[PDB]
Design a binder for this molecule. Structure first.
Ligand SMILES: Nc1nc2c(ncn2[C@H]2C[C@H](O)[C@@H](COP(=O)(O)OP(=O)(O)OP(=O)(O)O)O2)c(=O)[nH]1
Ligand SMILES: Nc1nc2c(ncn2[C@H]2C[C@H](O)[C@@H](COP(=O)(O)OP(=O)(O)OP(=O)(O)O)O2)c(=O)[nH]1
Ligand SMILES: [Mn+2]
Ligand SMILES: [Mn+2]
Lengths: 178, 174
DNA sequence: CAGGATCCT
DNA sequence: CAGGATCCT
């Protein structure tokens, strides 16, 4: 909200800096968050020229760690403060090159990954259309899975691309989703 | 600000004839559709606020009742306001007090009254007991496997006894 | 469309 | 225990 606007390139340099610097405390132990479990989402992934904030999705190996990842987040040698922080969303105000920016951290479990990536990539208008179409065929789609009568629909997929095509829609790269 | 029980009762009495909503038309809220709930109904000597449940004749009016609430002969402001809860800061005498307005549909009335009467500790026990027999109780109804359990009850007393619990007057619930 | 964190009810 | 309003995501 109050955070400064970033250029796409500014955002990419922040993500790159953070890729090696995130960690969390787990019952005392300090566990590094692997760069490969950090997916850049939001307008940055859609490669928009200006961004209101930086959105990172964190992929967590086991459900037991959800309690601990965002609520005990750490960033090596970066000045920041917490706006709000639960298990699924944490909003930080970070200091970067003498400016204050909003950094949004989200968590997905490994089995949720492609649904999460699809959700947090957006844009909002695109997701409303996609979900409404699935709603007319009696499905509910969210960031956790595809559902039918409050029951998980177990799709045999791994990637976002595979998800979208399994949902019965045309795949477009993030940049071309409107 | 904190109220005595009697202060609270005089506020409710004043408001009983003064609530209305728009909606183009201005519709009076009947005193008989206004139930005092919360610690006032439990007759606690001191209260943190005044809680009133408003009973709505039809579901189509939910959109309009609290979101277009009006009070004749009173100065106030809205804190927050949705279809189910509206919180007002009212001027009474020479003081500011919190007034909480809740809505229940007619078919929900006894569930709402039971919920908003409390106290919280009592409701947690009651609901946990029903949870062990696979029911869910809330302010809207009694449910089983995401299906409304159609008890044909009218009053709160009838509800509690139908739920299989001992009826106690609000003052003695704990 | 769908859901999350906060601070309540 | 179970859920609501606000302002986000
Ligand atoms: N389903 C759904 N998802 C949303 C909604 N708002 C945001 N999201 C998801 C998709 C977004 O790409 C992601 C990040 O939200 P942001 O508000 O940061 O928007 P985005 O990053 O797209 O642009 P911006 O930060 O404004 O440059 O969260 C919503 O109303 N519904
Ligand atoms: N199920 C449930 N009901 C609640 C909860 N908190 C409040 N309520 C309901 C029952 C309460 O009697 C009613 C009014 O809440 P209040 O916070 O105003 O407490 P109460 O009025 O009993 O005392 P006070 O207002 O503090 O004098 O709302 C809760 O956590 N769970
Ligand atoms: Mn963003
Ligand atoms: Mn109260």
């Amino acid at each position: 909200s109050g955070g400064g606007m970033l250029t796409l390139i500014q955002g990419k340099k922040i993500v790159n800096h953070l890729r090696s610097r995130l960690a969390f405390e787990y019952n005392g132990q300090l566990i590094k968050i692997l760069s490969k479990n950090i997916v850049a989402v939001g307008s940055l992934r859609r490669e928009e020229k200006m961004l209101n904030d930086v959105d990172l999705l964190i992929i967590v190996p086991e459900k037991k760690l959800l309690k601990h990842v965002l609520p005990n987040i750490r960033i090596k040698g970066l000045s920041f403060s917490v706006k709000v922080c639960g298990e699924r969303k944490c909003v930080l105000f970070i200091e970067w090159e003498k400016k204050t920016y909003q950094l949004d951290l989200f968590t997905a479990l490994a089995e949720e990954k492609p649904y999460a990536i699809f959700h947090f990539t957006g844009p909002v208008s695109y997701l409303i259309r996609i979900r409404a179409a699935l709603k007319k065929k009696n499905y509910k789609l969210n960031q956790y899975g595809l559902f039918k009568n409050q029951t998980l629909v177990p799709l045999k997929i791994t990637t976002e691309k595979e998800l979208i095509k399994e949902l019965g829609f045309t795949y477009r790269i993030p940049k071309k989703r409107l």
